[PDB]
């Protein structure tokens, strides 16, 4: 029975490939040959943040584009005032090995997690004035890789147990568990409408999930190695992914296939993070080579390079208003570019 | 805008308080050494933790040696795919790799050798020294002293290996036991020495699960690692 099941799966995968190929009437590269290229843009470090002791792994911009939170594996979670470089809070973490952080859309809560397999929610506006642990989520069986807030009461989490889950903060129980990924889930991105999200799970594939229906809608398998970064296109109809193969790929949720691949001859290192600008024309990706490249989403060329760091780039996030982009690195320093 | 200046002053006061707190945190942090405990589940690593102490994804054991703070992390409740979460420990002082020597018939010794090679040759772990604990020495001694488990059946190079002249055996061990012990030690070493970079070093140690010297051994390896790093910084080594 197993052989017949595998044969049926292979035949239906071949049917999927044939259907996808039939829709490949033309390539995005050919269509975008006419548009004016961005040329060259040279960003400069406008602010430098210092105070973290160990390597910084993750950060998140606020919805107001003023406050941001960054997580360092020394056990400290710090909230920064982007405009004035001041520090608003310095939350001490129970577990030093924090691997993710998140900022609530309303900003009333901050979440983080790591190798402890527990996601802790911190309340920033307690009447006492001090930061306190509001809720602890301990249903996962692996390190927390990523987490993002849907609202003040709903948070989606990524774990190394190969399954994603939706958590009801007030109840503290998993409302829905997403399964189907083979490898460790690394990055999580919520769609602009908050109804869909995508993630790569170290199996060279990206899965599209429905937050309410609790099932996988589409699967993309254009990558060759583990996927470390994922981010939606600003319109929500496409998303870009970063993988260890040193190539970034853009997928469209309606075409159901890769549109183009971003790569170059002399880059042989994996991508750690990826993000889009407000217009979506600029794709910013962090690399293990201590610098971040800027790619033209349409013309498939490098528009600029950010080389303010001297260690591995761990995180990269653009402001909601698109005014500036902040990048973190293992050197324990954050550079804000504009 | 007097309110703006007032809130700016309040923010500066909060920043000063946070700076003082972070300075204290930095002072305490730099004085503490972090260690990673690794090895197969069948190994005696669990007994070592219990001796030194005398569902979470990681366990922390804190002990003081000569009034020196050491933090040890045991990665439990984690999947066997170590290639991702292992990168987090790229800044640890040393990695305590515990391998049971008496594990040759799955051939757990070969798996341990491959894992050690992977950690040593990893891109991000090249800056971390590895403390190699060769555990279960009594089991190996009783297995090789009289038994049918031939080492050459699983390691054919053993038949043409002789104990090095620069070896110090404990008074009373049979020459065959010492030969097997040093063969395993050199098999582990040949992976590390092959790098030739000198950025990190391996410190093999014949160990028993009940040995109380393990704490002293770890202290000595930490001292040696720090001294070698400082000497290489000063171009002495």
């Amino acid at each position: 029975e197993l052989d017949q099941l595998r044969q049926e799966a292979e035949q239906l995968k071949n049917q999927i490939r044939d259907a996808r190929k039939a829709c490949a009437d033309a390539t995005l590269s050919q269509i975008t040959n006419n548009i004016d290229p961005v040329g060259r843009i040279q960003m400069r470090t406008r602010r430098t943040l210092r105070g973290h002791l160990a390597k910084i792994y993750a950060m998140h911009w606020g919805t107001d584009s003023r406050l941001l939170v960054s997580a360092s594996q020394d056990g400290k979670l710090i909230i920064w005032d982007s405009y004035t470089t001041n520090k608003v809070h310095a939350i001490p973490l129970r577990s030093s090995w924090v691997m993710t952080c998140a900022y609530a859309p309303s900003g009333n809560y901050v979440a983080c997690g790591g190798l402890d397999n527990i996601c802790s929610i911190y309340n920033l506006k307690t009447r006492e004035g001090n930061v306190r642990v509001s809720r602890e989520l301990a249903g996962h069986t692996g390190y927390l890789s990523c987490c993002r807030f849907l609202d003040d009461n709903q948070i989606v989490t990524s774990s190394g147990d190969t399954t994603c889950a939706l958590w009801d903060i007030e109840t503290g129980q998993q409302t829905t568990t997403f399964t189907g990924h083979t490898g460790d889930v690394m990055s999580l991105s919520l769609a602009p409408d908050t109804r869909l999200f995508v993630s790569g799970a170290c199996d060279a594939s990206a899965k599209l999930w429905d937050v309410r229906e609790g099932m996988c809608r589409q699967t993309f398998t254009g990558h060759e190695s583990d996927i470390n970064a994922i981010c939606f296109f600003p319109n929500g109809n496409a998303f870009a992914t970063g993988s260890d193969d040193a190539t970034c790929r853009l997928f469209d949720l309606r075409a159901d296939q890769e549109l183009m691949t971003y790569s170059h001859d002399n880059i042989i290192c994996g991508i750690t993070s990826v993000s889009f600008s407000k217009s979506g024309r600029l794709l910013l990706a962090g690399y293990d080579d201590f610098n971040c490249n800027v790619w033209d989403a349409l013309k498939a060329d490098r528009a600029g390079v950010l080389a303010g760091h001297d260690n591995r780039v761990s995180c990269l996030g653009v402001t909601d208003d698109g005014m500036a982009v902040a990048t973190g690195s293992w050197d324990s320093f954050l550079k804000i570019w504009n | 805008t007097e309110d703006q200046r007032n809130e700016e002053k309040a923010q500066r006061e909060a920043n000063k308080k946070i700076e003082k707190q972070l300075q204290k945190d930095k002072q305490v942090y730099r004085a503490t050494h972090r260690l990673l405990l690794l090895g197969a589940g069948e190994s005696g690593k669990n007994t070592i933790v219990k001796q030194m102490r005398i569902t979470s994804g990681i366990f922390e054991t804190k002990f003081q040696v000569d009034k020196v703070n050491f933090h040890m992390f045991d990665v439990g409740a984690q999947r066997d795919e170590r290639r991702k979460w292992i990168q987090c420990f790229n800044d640890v002082t040393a990695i305590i790799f515990v391998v049971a020597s008496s594990s040759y018939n799955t051939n757990r010794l070969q798996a341990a050798l491959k894992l050690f090679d992977s950690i040593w040759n990893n891109k991000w772990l090249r800056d971390t020294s590895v403390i190699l604990f060769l555990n279960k020495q009594d089991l190996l001694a009783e297995k090789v002293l009289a038994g049918k488990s031939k080492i050459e059946d699983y390691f054919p190079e053993f038949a043409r290996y002789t104990t090095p002249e620069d070896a110090t055996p404990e008074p009373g061990e049979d020459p065959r036991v010492t030969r097997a012990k040093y063969f395993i030690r050199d098999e582990f070493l040949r992976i590390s020495t092959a790098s030739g970079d000198g950025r990190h070093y391996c410190y093999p140690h014949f160990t028993c699960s009940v040995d109380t010297e393990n704490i002293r051994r770890v202290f000595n390896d930490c001292r040696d690692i720090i001294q070698r790093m400082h000497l290489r910084q000063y171009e002495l080594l």
């Epitope: 170290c202 060279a204 060759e224 190695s225 583990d226 260890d244 | 795919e81 290639r83 990893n122 891109k123």
Partner: nanobody, 128 residues
Framework: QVQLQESGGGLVQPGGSLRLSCAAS????????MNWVRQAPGKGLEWVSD????????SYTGSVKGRFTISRDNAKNTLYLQMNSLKPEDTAVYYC?????????????????????RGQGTQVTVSS
């Protein structure tokens, strides 16, 4: 999609020889290290032999050293494992596995849990 298709197997009398093959597609074959692993009935995964990108470096497990031969053909994205003088203990399902990253010799393809970059495997039986 990353696909690995092992071929060759069946039953062979002890002391014979067998040729295993591994078709590869969906990735740049030359940029990844490859190795062979096996799982005997009732036993866990075992590493057999590995080959570098260009093949200049080759290694075998002690119980297979000098007995089998691992070779790769980057021109047609195929990997081979020549086996001779087989013994009953060699009976096991042999999986053709590719460990994660290119341009790196660090390699973690012995994990017990389902590995995304290994093929279905082929059964090899050694009996009279």
């Amino acid at each position: 999609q990353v696909q690995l298709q092992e071929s060759g197997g069946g039953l062979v009398q002890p002391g014979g020889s067998l040729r295993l093959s591994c078709a590869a597609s969906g990735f740049t074959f030359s940029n990844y290290k490859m190795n062979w692993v096996r799982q005997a009935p009732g036993k866990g995964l075992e590493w057999v032999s590995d080959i570098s990108q260009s093949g200049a470096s080759i290694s075998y497990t002690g119980s297979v050293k000098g007995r089998f031969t691992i070779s790769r053909d980057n021109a047609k994205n195929t990997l081979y494992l020549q086996m001779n003088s087989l013994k009953p203990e060699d009976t096991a399902v042999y999986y053709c596995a590719r460990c994660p990253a290119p341009f790196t010799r660090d390699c973690f393809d012995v994990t017990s849990t389902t590995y995304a970059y290994r093929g279905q495997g082929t059964q090899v039986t050694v009996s009279s």
